[PDB]
Amino acid sequence: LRLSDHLLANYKKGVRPVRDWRKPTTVSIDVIMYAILNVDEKNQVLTTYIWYRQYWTDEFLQWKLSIPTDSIWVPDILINEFVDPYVYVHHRGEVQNYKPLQLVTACSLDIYNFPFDVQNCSLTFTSWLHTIQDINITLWRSPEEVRSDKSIFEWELLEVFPQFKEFSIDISNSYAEMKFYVIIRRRPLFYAVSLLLPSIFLMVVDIVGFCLPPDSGERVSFKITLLLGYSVFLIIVSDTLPATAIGTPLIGVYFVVCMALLVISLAETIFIVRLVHKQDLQRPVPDWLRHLVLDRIAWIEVARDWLRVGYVLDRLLFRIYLLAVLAYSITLVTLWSIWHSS
Amino acid sequence: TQPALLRLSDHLLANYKKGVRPVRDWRKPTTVSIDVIMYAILNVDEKNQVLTTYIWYRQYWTDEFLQWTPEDFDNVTKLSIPTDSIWVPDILINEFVDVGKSPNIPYVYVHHRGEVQNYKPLQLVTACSLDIYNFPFDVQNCSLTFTSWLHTIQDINITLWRSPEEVRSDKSIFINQGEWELLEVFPQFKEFSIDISNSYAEMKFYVIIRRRPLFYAVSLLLPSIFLMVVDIVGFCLPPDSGERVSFKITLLLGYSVFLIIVSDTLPATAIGTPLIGVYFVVCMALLVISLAETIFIVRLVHKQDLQRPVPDWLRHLVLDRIAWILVARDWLRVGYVLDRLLFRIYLLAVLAYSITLVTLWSIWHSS
Amino acid sequence: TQPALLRLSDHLLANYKKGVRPVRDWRKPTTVSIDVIMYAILNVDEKNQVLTTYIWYRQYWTDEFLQWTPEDFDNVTKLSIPTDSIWVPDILINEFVDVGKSPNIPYVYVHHRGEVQNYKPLQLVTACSLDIYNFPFDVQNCSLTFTSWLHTIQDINITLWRSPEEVRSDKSIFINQGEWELLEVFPQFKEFSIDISNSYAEMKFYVIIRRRPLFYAVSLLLPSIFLMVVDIVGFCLPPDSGERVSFKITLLLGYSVFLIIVSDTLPATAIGTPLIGVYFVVCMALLVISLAETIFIVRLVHKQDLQRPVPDWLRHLVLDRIAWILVARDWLRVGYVLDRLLFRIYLLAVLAYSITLVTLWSIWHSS
Amino acid sequence: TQPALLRLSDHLLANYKKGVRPVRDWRKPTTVSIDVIMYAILNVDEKNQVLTTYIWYRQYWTDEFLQWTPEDFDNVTKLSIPTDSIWVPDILINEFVDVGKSPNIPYVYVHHRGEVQNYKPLQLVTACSLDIYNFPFDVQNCSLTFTSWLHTIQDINITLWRSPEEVRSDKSIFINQGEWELLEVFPQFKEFSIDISNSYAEMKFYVIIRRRPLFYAVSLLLPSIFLMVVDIVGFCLPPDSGERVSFKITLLLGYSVFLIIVSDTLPATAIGTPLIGVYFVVCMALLVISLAETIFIVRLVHKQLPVPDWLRHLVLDRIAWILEVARDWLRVGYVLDRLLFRIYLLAVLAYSITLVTLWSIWHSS
Ligand SMILES: NCCc1c[nH]c2ccc(O)cc12
Ligand SMILES: NCCc1c[nH]c2ccc(O)cc12
């Protein structure tokens, strides 16, 4: 009890421990990651669980002692991109600080590879107000060699490595910047089942629908039901994939491409249904665009007028849709290869 | 005591009282200089109220009790002492709904002439006016006001550390990510007085903000126009006694899904739904009317039913409305002419929808 | 000489002991006038029955130790004593389930006669009843009980700064743009006694609020009405025709999705579900029953599976039904009477839904 | 002259020092009565294994240094002393995780015989083992232990202000319209000792909370059973080789939306998913299998190949006993579709049975 009274008398919080104020103090911090947490995909902020572990170098306190955090000085080393009591002090001249934190740090998020995304984010360390001409953050050891190889970890933590430069930080002329880039990976299984699994069947059922007779009215009902299916799947699209200034990911483009393609197919099918003997109306073609289109096809009552053109247009659209499906498959293969590479 | 930093700090904080305002004459109000630099507007979340933002905040007021003269002390020109030892003005936001989670930092700089610098980040959450009538092409005008919560004008006064024209166009450190882009910050100085004649000092920072609708356009708009163009052929291309019974209900369910999608991302507000939602409701009503028409004039009601006398004065109307616009046979003719009328109404509705989307885009771009 | 403020603050705070109730006679209670201004209703959580609201709170008590003659201290009649340096009473809301992220105001005005004014913004997370039987046309009242945690009437007595009418009809700074509209704030003071000699002062503010249902009406009421209307009008199709089968199938798919998201959207409390959830699940059951009727119809005529069996239950039940409403052929007649019965049931259900909506709106608008 | 309250407070705290046990004698201990009243169960995070409550915790210890004759201080028989100027028992919670944000009450009465009372609201966050295997019909049993911390009895003897019967039915102030229903608060007294030399004193405020399933009845159970019935009637209605693939994929999309809602509603634990997530996943798997088989059969029949004959013998012998070369393919597709329908009916029967069994266990409490 009386030990604290003696030590607290000859100590001031506001002053830096220095023999002379010209000499700059040295502060060391080692960042410990654990249990990576949810990342808000909106490209605004990500939340992670961290351990601080700050080590000091020189203090004018000499005589294990436990003291409240308000009885010893703690430097205001914080994070530049940052949003949202017992002290382990030794009599030899070293102090230890134990406190868990959540960064909830703002960063730049990449969605263009959803859901197989391996994005990079930074953890910059500095002091918000200190000029840091005397409290530089030169570290005790280099975390590059030791931290990178192994760590103690819906998201996967992959690699955290440091990087330093002298002059930086925009709040003031701050000498403290030891950036901690963070690499994370996402579990895609739930996202795969929720998005890719129902969508890929929406690519193969439409192929099956092309086997139906184009002139038959049953294909119209099939396309109507698939249009309702895309209407329903739009809810999944809106709920699952996030919003970003870059827009929808590379997967989201193919969804609207296939929806537009099926809309065009349905419109063509309905037009052919009208123009075949169901309604016909002896409607003639100008015979100019007809022969032009026939010449284009040449390289890779009222029956032949409409049935042939409808069939060839349906075959062309089926080829286009199969090409779109192949592009989708290639995109997923490439995304999975690049994500599993990391 | 050889470094004498302890001596300097204890000399400045010897007879200093934190609670007393630092003025030699009590009749002179203390003037606070405010600098606000935007960082992000992350997590706008619900659009009924609330606006989350991150700013970098500064304060510059002169303390007359910390005017220690140099050339006799350690010859320093800059001292840092904890914020818990000096008087700090009670500057607060009127819309200060949530304090948020921000690191409260000590050690405000104190100059050798007494000037105090109070750099501090603020993770603000404020309540402002959010008009979603033009969604997704939305531009919002939210206020970040700063005022003394309890001190009056003759106690605390508010000024700007830099001229307003510098504040408007100094979005330097702002990160240009997320769905929202900051356009303008407008500082204005309007006094505050609610009940009695104790004049307050209030400064308004009008944060003009803009939304990027690219994702929203791709996700919600382009499918909507696809359903419009499906309806346009659907009214005229499929004839009666066909698949129209399933067609109209399927597109009606699609429009209902569109209303659902608009609803989930847009919270309840004094305005019911944006203009796009109003047009979706109108198209749903038109589809209901078309379905009622088809069922009532085709199939079991009229096509299968026989010897049902249908008179009325509508045949007198079609002798004139068909000129203005341009029992089985009678039923087919009346169904066809009313279907053409519904075609014209829906074509007008789609034209109005496209025109209003163009108008909203023009307003959003010309902001 | 010393500044006027420093001398006055030293004179007031010398030999001043907080934690002692500032009265020169301990037998007279300290009257703490209370005034509350409602600023915003941040959130009304029916899940946890907690009301999140933001109010501007003012206190008013007389400290008999902080009295000074204005003739001295250079004619000063007001000060800024820190809050944590004097006696501040123990009034707090009994309904707290969370303190809230309310900023602290470290200053008060002490007048030259001892009158102390406390201004602070309170972010309240308080428990309520939150009956959702009338959703969306929902009117709810919440109490804000201000009483001292452990001070009786003989120690602390709570009154109103303003007259009850002024508190009731304030509507000054409230944000009239959210989901909830503030109807009134009803203050009334009742002495609360746990026993015969431990009466406690208590002030109750009744925050009566009213939801804005236009958004919910457009999002939920219009689609959920159009869908049942088209379901009614689709019974005009022949019961035995296969065109109704696809109609029923796709209507089932769309309406099932619609109800999935609706049931996700609707709130739920301990009492159960709103009055419209009953009609929604009733329509669920009715649509399932209609599809089962189609199942029975299709198997009769699509194949020869049901042609061989004959009705063993006879027409007695069917005869009673046709009296109440007013081999194949027999099965088709059974299908027709069941279809007519389901038509009556749908008509009754939709009529009841419309009457319920009208009654809910009339209750909501009247009060 | 001097105010009675001011003079009395000056006299009481002049010789008083915080940190020393108020009992003048060095032998007999300091009894500390306790009275805990539950107000609300704010949050139960099963993933983090933290129980967030809100109690009204009261202490009644008879201080000995705060004794005064009323006749000497203008008949003041009761005084309000700041809680930071006198000794207060250091009773903490053994299951402590976080203290939360609770209002600060800085006053405590002392009577003319030194009878201090300390009422305080606590937004406690405690760690208790939570099992969600019976969601939403789950009954939890979370402890609440108040310990002596520094003192090792014969200094502080924690006792109850009221008998366990009074504290058991503390529903006079509870907000009983939330998700969790407070069943009982049963206190248990037991002494634990680090060493045989001396023992500690503690209480065990067993708090049993039962979840109200009516919150999720319309959100999960009714939509789930509606989708089960819809899947059944969608197996029944369309022909197996007919125009069903479009309807089946629309149904699959709807049920995937339902699973999105479920994942946004159900809670997650390190133990695993509740008993209904298994049924949801099983129904998804069977629906996907049915859609894939129907797609395969329709593709083969529209291909126009007759039978592999490595399975026809077993299908006729075994698979057929569930109860034009493409015609045999259509028949075997129909047989497998009927088998899948029977499997789905068995699965929905199991789902219906387990819900009543879970409800009965929940109702048994
Ligand atoms: N910035 C608000 C200052 C203010 C002026 N009048 C008030 C009345 C109550 C209150 O809490 C605050 C105020
Ligand atoms: N002085 C008010 C004490 C108090 C607070 N909450 C209470 C609830 C019930 C009661 O009898 C008393 C109280």
Q: What is the DSSP string of C85-103?
A: GS----EEETTEEE---PP
Whether residues B280 and B208 share a domain: the answer is: no
3-state secondary structure of C81: coil
Quote the CA–CA distance of D96 and C106 in Å, as a whole number.
Answer: 31
Distance CA B250, CA C249 (A): 11
Instruction: Provide the shortest C-alpha distance from residue C118 to chain A (in Å).
Output: 29
Task: Yes or no: say if D124 and D100 are a contact pair by the CB < 8 Å rule.
Answer: yes
Distance from CA of D242 to the nearest CA of C (A): 12
Bridge partners of D188, per DSSP, are D204
Q: Does residue D167 sit in the same domain as residue D311? A: no
Closest to A106 (Cα-Cα) out of A155, A44, A50: A44
Q: How many folded domains does chain B comprise?
A: 2
| Three-class secondary structure of residue C3 per DSSP | coil
Which amino acid is present at B58?
R
C5 touches chain D (CB under 8 A): no
For residue C181, the SS3 value is: strand
Report the DSSP beta bridge partners of residue C127.
C50
| Chain D residues inside the 8 Å CB shell of A222 | 243, 246
Task: Report the 10 Å Cβ neighbour count for C158.
Answer: 23
Ligand 2 centroid, distance to B105 Cα (angstroms): 38
Rg over alpha carbons for chain A, rounded to the nearest Å, is 33
Cβ atoms of C192 and C200 within 8 Å: the answer is: yes
Cis peptide before C136 (omega within 30 of 0): yes
- Dihedral sign for Cα B130, B132, B134, B137, please: positive
Minimum distance, in Å, between the CA of residue C262 and any CA atom of chain A: 13
DSSP label of D192: E
Residue C198 token pair: 């431990």
C200 lines ligand 2 (CB under 6 A): yes
Residue carrying the six token digits 């609707």: C266
Q: Which pair of structure tokens corresponds to residue C178?
A: 């959210």
* Residue in this structure with the two tokens 């129907």, named with its chain if needed: D294
Tell me the two tokens of residue D9. Answer: 């407070």
Q: Is residue D257 helix, strand or coil?
A: helix
On chain D, the residues whose CB falls within 8 A of the CB of A221 are: 243, 246
Contact by Cβ (8 Å): A105, A121:
yes
- The token pair that represents C348 in the structure block: 């009754």
Report the distance separating Cα D7 and Cα A289, nearest Å: 110
CB < 8 Å to A212, chain D: 302
CB contact under 8 A, A76 and B105: yes
Q: How far is CA D308 from the centre of its chain?
A: 55
Interrupted after residues, chain A (C–N over 2.5 Å): 63, 84, 153, 300
Alpha-carbon distance C61 to nearest alpha carbon in chain A (angstroms): 34
b/e D243-259 (16+ beta carbons within 10 angstroms → b): bbbbbbbbbbbbbbbbb
What is the DSSP secondary-structure string of A204-230? HHHHHHTTS-TTSTHHHHHHHHHHHHH
The CA C44 to ligand 2 mean position distance, Å, reads 25
Q: Do residues A12 and A159 share a domain?
A: yes
For residue D186, give the DSSP letter: E
Nearest residue in chain D measured CA to CA from C101: D101
Kindly state if the Cβ of C148 falls inside 6 Å of ligand 2: yes
From which experimental method does this structure derive? cryo-EM
Beta bridge partners of C200: C192
Contact call for residues B56 and C119 (beta carbons, < 8 A): no
Instruction: Please give the Cα distance from B122 to B120 (Å, whole number).
Output: 7
How many angstroms separate the most distant Cα atoms in chain D? 119
Secondary structure of chain B in HEC code, one letter for each residue = CCCCHHHHHHHHCCCCCCCCCCCCCCCCCEEEEEEEEEEECCCCCCCCCCEEEEEEEEEEEECCCCCCCCCCCCCCCEEEECHHHCCCCCEECCCEEECCCCCCCCCEEEECCCEEECCEEEEEEECCCCCCCCCCCCEEEEECCEEECCCCCCCEEEEECCCHHHHHCCCCCCCCCCCEEEEEEEEECCCECCCCCCCECEEEEEEEEEECCHHHHHHHHHHHHHHHHHHHHHHHCCCCCCCHHHHHHHHHHHHHHHHHHHHHHCCCCCCCCCHHHHHHHHHHHHHHHHHHHHHHHCCHHHHHCCCCCCCCCHHHHHHHHHHHHCCHHHHHHHHHHHHHHHHHHHHHHHHHHHHHHHHHHHHHHCC
User: Which three-class secondary structure string do you get for C6-28?
Assistant: HHHHHHHHCCCCCCCCCCCCCCC
Enclosing H/E stretch for A45:
strand A45-51
What is the DSSP secondary structure assignment for residue C263, as one 8-state letter?
Answer: H
> Residue A278: how many CB atoms within 10 A of its CB?
14
Neighbouring-strand partners of residue C185: C207
Question: Is residue D108 within 8 angstroms of chain C, CB to CB?
Answer: yes
C-alpha pair distances (Å), B2 with each of A14, A22, B81:
16, 13, 19
Report how far ligand 1's centroid is from the alpha carbon of B150 (Å). Answer: 7
Distance, CA of B299 to CA of B303 (rounded, Å): 5
Cis-peptide into C274, omega within 30 deg = no
Residue C264 to residue C258: CA distance in whole angstroms: 10
Give the CA dihedral B317, B321, B322, B325, nearest 10 degrees. Answer: -170
Chain B within 8 Å of C80 (Cβ-Cβ)? Answer: yes
Same domain for A21 and A111, yes or no, is yes
**Omega of the bond leading into D136 within 30 degrees of 0 (cis):** yes
Within 8 A by CB and 6+ apart from D331, the residues are none
Q: Which ranges constitute the DSSP H helices of chain C?
A: 4-13, 164-168, 214-216, 222-233, 243-265, 275-301, 316-325, 328-366
Instruction: Give the residues across from C208 on adjacent strands.
Output: C141, C184
Chains within contact range of chain A (3+ C-beta pairs < 8 Å): B, C, D
Give the position, in ligand 2's atom list, of the atom nearest the Cα of C151: 1
Contacts of B269 in chain C (CB under 8 A): 177-179, 212, 215
Task: Tell me: cis bond preceding D213? Omega within 30 of 0 counts.
Answer: no
Indicate the residue among B149, B183, B212 that finishes a domain. Answer: B212
Closest CA to B360 of B272, B279, B270: B279
Q: Is D271 on the interface with A (CB under 8 A)?
A: no
Strand partners, B123: B54
The residue of chain A with its CA nearest to that of C243 is A221
Q: How many CA atoms lie within 13 A of D167 on its CB side?
A: 25
d(CA C90, CA D343): 66
A232 close to A198: Cβ distance less than 8 angstroms: no
**Quick one: B261 and B195 in the same domain?**
no
Side-chain-side CA neighbours of residue B260 (13 Å): 29
Please classify residue C93 by burial: count the beta carbons closer than 10 Å to its beta carbon, then call 0-12 exposed, 13-18 middle and 19+ buried.
buried
C-alpha torsion sign, points A211, A216, A221, A227: positive
Interatomic CA distance for residues B250 and B256, integer angstroms: 10
Q: Does the beta carbon of D105 sit less than 6 angstroms from any atom of ligand 2?
A: no
User: For the purposes of burial, counting CB atoms within 10 Å of the CB of A224, is it exposed (0-12), middle (13-18) or buried (19 or more)?
Assistant: buried
User: Which protein residue has the closest C-alpha to ligand 2 atom 8?
Assistant: D173
Q: Which candidate, A18, A137, A142, places its Cα nearest to that of A73? A: A18
Looking at this protein, which amino acid is placed at residue A15?
V
CB D56 within 8 A of CB D37: yes
In angstroms, what is the span from residue C156 Cα to ligand 2's centroid? 14
Q: Are residues B254 and B190 in the same domain?
A: no
Residues A181, A239 share a domain: no
Both tokens of residue C11?
A: 């004179």
A168 secondary structure, DSSP code? B
Q: D299 to chain A: which residues are within 8 Å by CB?
A: 208, 211
Closest-CA residue of chain C to A231: C254
Q: What are phi and psi of C37, to 5 degrees?
A: -115, 125
Residue position matching structure tokens 């083992």: D129
Q: How far apart are CA B267 and CA B49, in angstroms?
A: 9
The C-alpha atoms of residue C290 and residue B10 are separated, in whole angstroms, by 87
Contacts of C230 (CB under 8 A, 6+ apart): B249, B252, B288, B291, B292, C251
Q: For residue C228, how far is the Cα from the chain centroid?
A: 29
Atom of ligand 1 nearest to the CA of C57: 11
Which candidate, D49, D50, D362, D42, places its Cα nearest to that of D216? D362
B100: region left, alpha or beta (phi > 0 left; psi from -120 to 50 alpha): left
Residues B166 and B280 in one domain: no
Which atom of ligand 2 is found nearest the CA of C148? 1
Task: Give C46's strand partners.
Answer: none
Task: Give the position of tokens 């970003």.
Answer: A244
Write the CA distances from D312 to C80, D331, D335, integer angstroms. 95, 11, 11
Residue C117 φ then ψ, to 5°: -115, 130
Q: Are A27 and A56 in contact (CB under 8 A)?
A: yes
Residues enclosing ligand 1, CB less than 6 A? Answer: B 94, 147, 149, 194, 200; C 37, 56-58, 119, 121
CB of C211 within 8 A of CB of C179?
Answer: yes
Q: Provide CB contacts within 8 A for C302, sequence distance 6+.
A: C242
Q: Which two tokens stand for residue C224?
A: 């959920």
Write out chain B residues lying below 8 Å of C255, CB-based. 253
Last residue of a domain, one of D165, D188, D212: D212
Cβ–Cβ gap D251/C250 under 8 Å = no
Name the helix (H) or strand (E) containing D59. Answer: strand D50-61
Positive or negative, the Cα torsion across C128, C134, C135, C141?
negative
**Chain centroid to CA A139:** 30
Protein residue closest via CA to atom 11 of ligand 2: C194
Amino acid letter for position A187: R
Asked whether residue D247 falls in the same domain as residue D121, the answer is no
Which of C262-297 are b and which e, b meaning 16 or more Cβ less than 10 Å from the residue's Cβ?
Answer: bbbebbbbbeebbbbbebbbebbebbbebbbbbeeb
Contact with chain C for residue D40, Cβ under 8 A: yes
C305: CA distance to ligand 2 center in Å? 74
Note whether D262 contacts A: Cβ–Cβ < 8 A.
no
Do A159 and A282 fall into the same domain?
no
Residue D138 φ/ψ, nearest 5 degrees: -120, 140
Touching check for A126 and chain B: CB below 8 Å?
A: no
Q: Do the beta carbons of residue C221 and residue C350 sit within 8 Å? A: no
Both tokens of C95, joined, read 């309904």
Is C223 near chain A, with CB under 8 Å? Answer: no
- The pair of structure tokens assigned to B177 is 């990510």
Same domain, B337 and B358: yes
Q: Are residues B344 and B291 in the same domain?
A: yes
| Chain-chain contact of A235 with B261 (C-beta, under 8 angstroms) | yes
How many other C-beta atoms can be found within 10 angstroms of the C-beta atom of residue B125?
A: 19
Q: Residue A146 corresponds to which tokens in the numbers above? A: 């030791």
Burial, A30: exposed, middle or buried (Cβ in 10 Å; 0-12, 13-18, 19+)?
middle
In angstroms, rounded to a whole number, what is the distance separating the alpha carbons of residues A116 and D62? 66
Radius of gyration, alpha carbons of chain D: 33
User: Scanning every residue of chain D, which has its alpha carbon at the shortest distance from the alpha carbon of A236?
Assistant: D257
Ligand nearest to the CA of C39: 1
Find out whether B52 and B144 touch, Cβ atoms under 8 Å: no
Q: Is D272 on the interface with A (CB under 8 A)?
A: no
Encoded tokens for B275: 């203009």
Question: What token pair was written down for A191?
Answer: 């996202």
A298 contact D CB<8A: no
Q: Which H or E run contains D110?
A: strand D107-111
Measured CA to CA, the distance from residue D69 to residue B306 in angstroms comes to 108
Which among B9, B105, B220 has the least Cβ separation from residue A128?
B105
Question: Cα separation of C204 and C215, whole Å?
Answer: 32
Q: Which two tokens stand for residue A315?
A: 């075959």
Q: Is the Cβ–Cβ distance between B180 and B209 less than 8 Å?
A: yes
- The domain boundary, picked from B197, B212, B227, lies at B212
Domain encompassing residue C296: 213-367
Q: What number does the ligand 2 atom closest to the CA of D119 have?
A: 3
